[PDB]
Each structure stands twice: as structure tokens, then as C-alpha cells.
Ligand binder design. Structure first.
Ligand SMILES: Cc1cc(F)cc(C)c1Oc1ccc(C(C)(C)O)cc1-c1cn(C)c(=O)c2cc(-c3cnc(C4CCCC4)[nH]3)oc12
Length: 109
């Protein structure tokens, strides 16, 4: 249930992604009412965002680092599922994904 890693995810991975210029549409859940997307919550069975991941790291939700990494990935794949390729939100998620994977490669064991 590695804690060096969970701590790394919070202070380094999440911190870096959260500062990114493209982070803002992923810092909270997709408000399907505001954005007028009635199908979103039927299509996306496991919504995810960095708001929720942050809360989970700050409140001892995660069993281990892999469970948290799945959530980061779910956020990205949720975005690629729902939206057409080429859409701006997809380019944004793609940039965030490069960076996420970079930072994951320097993870302590
Ligand atoms: C990044 C971006 C740029 C824009 F010019 C317009 C939007 C809506 C936009 O996305 C969002 C803006 C605000 C919010 C808030 C903060 C209110 O929850 C969310 C999004 C947004 C985030 N994520 C992860 C998404 O997957 C989608 C998807 C959409 C979206 C809204 N309308 C669409 C489609 C369906 C109608 C034709 C375009 N997709 O908006 C978001």
C-alpha cells in the first residue's frame, strides 16, 4: 500500500498537473447541467477529475498508488470516450496525459 508513492502523487504529480494551463476543466467534475449534456452521466459510468483525486489523496481514500493512478487514467479515457478527437478538451487532456506519464516515470518504488 505504498505511501512514499501516494505522497509523491500528491505533492509532485498532482501539484504539477494542477498548475498546468490546461488543468482548469479537470479541477472539478463535469457539470453536465451547466454544460447541457444530458447523456454524459449515462455514457460515463465512472466520472473522474483532479478535484476528486485531490480529495482522495488528502483524505486517505486510496488503498495504494495504483488505485490513484487508475483514476488519473479514468479521467483521461473518460474525456476521450465522450468527446470527438480534435476537440479542444481532448488536446488539453492529451497534454495533461504526456505530462502525467513523464512524472509517473520518476516515481519512487
Ligand atoms: C474546455 C472547454 C472549452 C470551451 F470553449 C468550452 C467548454 C465547454 C470546455 O469544456 C469545459 C468547460 C467548463 C467545464 C466546467 C468547469 C463548467 O465543468 C467543463 C468543460 C468540459 C470538461 N470536460 C472534461 C469535458 O469532457 C467536457 C466536454 C464538454 C463539452 C461541452 N459541450 C460539448 C460537446 C457536445 C455539444 C457539442 C460539443 N462537450 O465540456 C467539457
Amino acid at each position: 500500500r505504498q505511501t512514499n508513492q501516494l505522497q509523491y502523487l500528491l505533492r509532485v504529480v498532482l501539484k504539477t498537473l494542477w498548475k498546468h494551463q490546461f488543468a482548469w476543466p479537470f479541477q472539478q467534475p463535469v457539470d453536465a447541467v451547466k454544460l447541457n449534456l444530458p447523456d454524459y452521466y449515462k455514457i460515463i459510468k465512472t466520472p473522474m477529475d483532479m478535484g476528486t483525486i485531490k480529495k482522495r489523496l488528502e483524505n486517505n481514500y486510496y488503498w495504494n498508488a495504483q488505485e490513484c493512478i487508475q483514476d488519473f487514467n479514468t479521467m483521461f479515457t473518460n474525456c476521450y470516450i465522450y468527446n470527438k478527437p480534435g476537440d479542444d478538451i481532448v488536446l488539453m487532456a492529451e497534454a495533461l496525459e504526456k505530462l502525467f506519464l513523464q512524472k509517473i516515470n520518476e516515481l519512487p518504488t
